[PDB]
Enzyme design. Structure first.
Site, PDB file in Angstrom:
ATOM      1  N   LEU A  75      -2.881 -16.235  33.167  1.00  0.00           N
ATOM      2  CA  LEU A  75      -4.223 -15.735  33.376  1.00  0.00           C
ATOM      3  C   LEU A  75      -5.047 -16.018  32.144  1.00  0.00           C
ATOM      4  O   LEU A  75      -4.594 -15.799  31.022  1.00  0.00           O
ATOM      5  CB  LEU A  75      -4.196 -14.247  33.647  1.00  0.00           C
ATOM      6  CG  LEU A  75      -3.342 -13.834  34.819  1.00  0.00           C
ATOM      7  CD1 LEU A  75      -3.326 -12.328  34.798  1.00  0.00           C
ATOM      8  CD2 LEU A  75      -3.962 -14.377  36.169  1.00  0.00           C
ATOM      9  N   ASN A  76      -6.256 -16.480  32.349  1.00  0.00           N
ATOM     10  CA  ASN A  76      -7.077 -16.960  31.248  1.00  0.00           C
ATOM     11  C   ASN A  76      -8.540 -16.845  31.590  1.00  0.00           C
ATOM     12  O   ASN A  76      -9.324 -17.704  31.188  1.00  0.00           O
ATOM     13  CB  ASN A  76      -6.796 -18.438  30.920  1.00  0.00           C
ATOM     14  CG  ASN A  76      -7.389 -18.858  29.588  1.00  0.00           C
ATOM     15  OD1 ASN A  76      -7.327 -18.107  28.645  1.00  0.00           O
ATOM     16  ND2 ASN A  76      -7.917 -20.052  29.502  1.00  0.00           N
ATOM     17  N   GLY A  78     -10.570 -13.669  31.828  1.00  0.00           N
ATOM     18  CA  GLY A  78     -11.322 -12.542  31.381  1.00  0.00           C
ATOM     19  C   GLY A  78     -12.048 -12.715  30.091  1.00  0.00           C
ATOM     20  O   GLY A  78     -11.969 -13.703  29.469  1.00  0.00           O
ATOM     21  N   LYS A  89      -9.988 -15.306  24.999  1.00  0.00           N
ATOM     22  CA  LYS A  89      -9.167 -14.613  24.030  1.00  0.00           C
ATOM     23  C   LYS A  89      -8.038 -15.500  23.536  1.00  0.00           C
ATOM     24  O   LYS A  89      -7.690 -15.468  22.351  1.00  0.00           O
ATOM     25  CB  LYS A  89      -8.610 -13.339  24.648  1.00  0.00           C
ATOM     26  CG  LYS A  89      -7.817 -12.510  23.621  1.00  0.00           C
ATOM     27  CD  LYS A  89      -7.193 -11.306  24.240  1.00  0.00           C
ATOM     28  CE  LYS A  89      -8.223 -10.239  24.491  1.00  0.00           C
ATOM     29  NZ  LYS A  89      -7.547  -9.005  24.956  1.00  0.00           N
ATOM     30  N   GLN A 156     -11.348 -19.277  38.927  1.00  0.00           N
ATOM     31  CA  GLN A 156     -11.413 -18.084  39.716  1.00  0.00           C
ATOM     32  C   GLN A 156     -12.813 -17.925  40.297  1.00  0.00           C
ATOM     33  O   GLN A 156     -13.766 -18.582  39.879  1.00  0.00           O
ATOM     34  CB  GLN A 156     -10.948 -16.892  38.888  1.00  0.00           C
ATOM     35  CG  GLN A 156     -11.960 -16.062  38.263  1.00  0.00           C
ATOM     36  CD  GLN A 156     -11.278 -14.896  37.567  1.00  0.00           C
ATOM     37  OE1 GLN A 156     -10.953 -14.971  36.370  1.00  0.00           O
ATOM     38  NE2 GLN A 156     -11.009 -13.817  38.343  1.00  0.00           N
ATOM     39  N   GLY A 184     -11.896  -9.570  38.678  1.00  0.00           N
ATOM     40  CA  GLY A 184     -10.632  -9.150  38.127  1.00  0.00           C
ATOM     41  C   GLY A 184      -9.553 -10.160  38.433  1.00  0.00           C
ATOM     42  O   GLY A 184      -9.749 -11.113  39.202  1.00  0.00           O
ATOM     43  N   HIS A 185      -8.363  -9.920  37.852  1.00  0.00           N
ATOM     44  CA  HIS A 185      -7.302 -10.895  38.037  1.00  0.00           C
ATOM     45  C   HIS A 185      -6.576 -10.760  39.383  1.00  0.00           C
ATOM     46  O   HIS A 185      -5.789 -11.645  39.722  1.00  0.00           O
ATOM     47  CB  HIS A 185      -6.303 -10.842  36.861  1.00  0.00           C
ATOM     48  CG  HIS A 185      -5.891  -9.463  36.448  1.00  0.00           C
ATOM     49  ND1 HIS A 185      -5.113  -8.646  37.245  1.00  0.00           N
ATOM     50  CD2 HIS A 185      -6.091  -8.780  35.283  1.00  0.00           C
ATOM     51  CE1 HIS A 185      -4.887  -7.506  36.606  1.00  0.00           C
ATOM     52  NE2 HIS A 185      -5.462  -7.569  35.412  1.00  0.00           N
ATOM     53  N   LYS A 374      -4.494  -6.035  23.549  1.00  0.00           N
ATOM     54  CA  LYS A 374      -5.751  -5.567  24.125  1.00  0.00           C
ATOM     55  C   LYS A 374      -6.837  -5.290  23.084  1.00  0.00           C
ATOM     56  O   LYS A 374      -8.028  -5.283  23.436  1.00  0.00           O
ATOM     57  CB  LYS A 374      -5.528  -4.290  24.928  1.00  0.00           C
ATOM     58  CG  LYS A 374      -4.656  -4.474  26.150  1.00  0.00           C
ATOM     59  CD  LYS A 374      -4.770  -5.902  26.741  1.00  0.00           C
ATOM     60  CE  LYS A 374      -3.774  -6.000  27.875  1.00  0.00           C
ATOM     61  NZ  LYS A 374      -3.228  -7.355  28.190  1.00  0.00           N
TER      62      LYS A 374
END
Ligand SMILES: O=c1ccn([C@@H]2O[C@H](COP(=O)(O)OP(=O)(O)O[C@H]3O[C@H](CO)[C@@H](O)[C@H](O)[C@H]3O)[C@@H](O)[C@H]2O)c(=O)[nH]1
Length: 482
Positions: A75-76, A78, A89, A156, A184-185, A374
């Site tokens: 996942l990449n 957000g 991030k 996404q 969201g993921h 986080k």
């Protein structure tokens, strides 16, 4: 037939050529919201999980066929706003000269050399992260860049922010791009389904997908989990960790008990069903229940395993969607500008799919599969010597810690943003492997070669000048002050 607001969302999404799978998924959520769903899951509605299988107990490895049928996705998509990041991030450095992306690519390179030559690797990017990710790979890993658009990137979806007043799509004349947000993921399933990518993957023979957070560099393929899912005919598996003090941003496992009344003289058997509760779904008046790590002691790692053909079957049979529980997140259209219109952003969490499959389970994993980031407090712990690099390029907590990360507490006035945290470690990252807890109060700067052991607090009451620490300082079970 839809409300006027919901039709206004369909029209907006169609005019923008949004995938139909996404429109369908969003509208089903929009129907829930318009009937009063908030996503809230109250403590009275769930019960804790008391026993699970554990990875440390497993020993059997999966044959090569299964291994070859596994795809890896990171996942990449957000934006880590809380860390004051306006880009991916995964581009931040985690060890000298190396970013999350760097170790991610090294994990894939190694696996291709030693486990499966033709490992399929994917990144789920968004509008806000695709650009910087691709140019990073262009510079450092051309073999990924070559197939970036062709087989690596999953883009996404974007869905409309909706006004709280009316549930209509928000307009933001000053910057219309702010009318849209990634959902969201949990959107991974939608995006994979709507793009045709999921059916392609199944067509090519892939049977499993292993998904993990971009920030979690301990998450890689473990062939015992694949053997375990094969044997137990499991279609969805969540790895959870025994929750620690540091596990406050995320979700925990919970159960409900659904009674399948038994036919033919066999009594109605209570049957446990598993579910995820993100912090955002805890009624905020009950957060202390959510945060009580004894009550809900299984923390979701977001290391997730999905049996691709069954995910595909399930989404086909639910109208081309996966009906994850909606999370009704409150913001303003320009999140920066609190004078802007209040909106809901409908989101889902990919770990919520544990409630979607009949044979979904969870497994307890040791802490070396979960090194999350986080906050900058996490990034301090990760950067220090408490985390080590494995041969296969995972970051893992050193054995000394006994699976307990150093408990880092940084003053949020000064270190919550990345620029502030960056000055904190300007002259070195302290040795932390022997530190059970470091708390920093007020404006402070580490020196070079500082060693912290035990419980260390560094405090500046003065709140005007930086309290700078001299090179070589070794603080042990102490409170240090100007
Ligand atoms: O729309 C989005 C949102 C997030 N992400 C990515 O998804 C990952 C997770 O996002 P993050 O915000 O970092 O974490 P949370 O969503 O809060 O929580 C997740 O991860 C926690 C553990 O770290 C689990 O406990 C939670 O259940 C799981 O939802 C990160 O890589 C994000 O970049 C996306 O790709 N798209």
């Amino acid at each position: 037939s839809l409300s006027a607001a919901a039709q206004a969302c369909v029209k907006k999404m169609r005019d923008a050529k949004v995938n139909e799978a996404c429109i369908r998924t969003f509208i089903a959520q929009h129907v829930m919201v318009s009937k009063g769903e908030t996503g809230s899951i109250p403590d009275s509605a769930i019960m804790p999980v008391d026993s699970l299988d554990a990875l440390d107990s497993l020993t059997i490895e999966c044959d090569n066929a299964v291994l070859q049928s596994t795809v890896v996705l990171k996942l990449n998509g957000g934006l880590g706003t809380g860390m004051g990041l306006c880009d991916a991030k995964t581009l931040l450095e985690v060890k000298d000269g190396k970013t999350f992306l760097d170790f991610t690519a090294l994990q894939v390179q190694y696996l291709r050399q030693h486990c499966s030559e033709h490992l399929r690797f994917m990144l789920m990017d968004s509008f806000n992260t695709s650009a910087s990710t691709k140019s990073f790979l262009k510079a450092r890993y051309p073999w990924l860049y070559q197939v970036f658009d062709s087989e690596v990137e999953l883009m996404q979806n974007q869905v409309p922010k909706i006004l709280q007043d009316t549930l209509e799509p928000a307009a933001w004349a000053e910057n219309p791009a702010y009318e849209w947000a990634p959902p969201g993921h949990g959107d991974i399933y939608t995006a994979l389904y709507g793009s045709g990518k999921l059916q392609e993957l199944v067509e090519q023979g892939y049977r499993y997908m292993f998904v993990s957070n971009g920030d979690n560099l301990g998450a890689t393929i473990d062939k015992r989990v694949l053997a375990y899912m094969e044997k137990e005919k499991i279609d969805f598996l969540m790895e959870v960790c025994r929750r620690t003090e540091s596990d406050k941003k995320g979700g925990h496992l919970a159960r409900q008990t659904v009674y399948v009344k038994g036919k033919d003289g066999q009594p109605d058997a209570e049957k446990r069903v598993l579910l995820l509760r993100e912090s955002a779904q805890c009624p905020k008046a009950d957060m202390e229940s959510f945060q009580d790590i004894n009550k809900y002691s299984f923390f979701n790692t977001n290391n997730l395993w999905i049996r691709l053909p069954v995910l595909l079957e399930t989404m086909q049979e639910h109208g081309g969607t996966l009906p994850l529980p909606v999370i009704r997140n409150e913001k303003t259209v320009d999140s920066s500008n609190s004078a802007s219109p209040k909106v809901y952003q409908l989101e889902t969490a990919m770990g919520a799919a544990i409630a979607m499959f009949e044979s979904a389970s969870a497994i307890v994993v040791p802490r070396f599969r979960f090194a999350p980031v986080k906050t900058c407090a996490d990034l301090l712990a990760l950067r220090s010597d408490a985390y080590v690099v494995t041969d296969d390029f995972r970051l893992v907590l050193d054995d000394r810690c006994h699976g307990h990360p150093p408990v880092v507490d940084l003053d949020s006035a000064h270190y919550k943003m990345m620029n502030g945290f960056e000055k904190l470690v300007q002259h070195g990252v302290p040795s932390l492997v022997e530190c059970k807890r470091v708390t920093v109060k007020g404006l402070v700067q580490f020196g070079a070669g500082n060693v912290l052991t035990g419980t260390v607090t560094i405090e500046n009451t003065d709140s005007a000048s930086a309290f700078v620490i001299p090179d070589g300082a070794k603080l042990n079970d102490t409170t240090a002050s100007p």
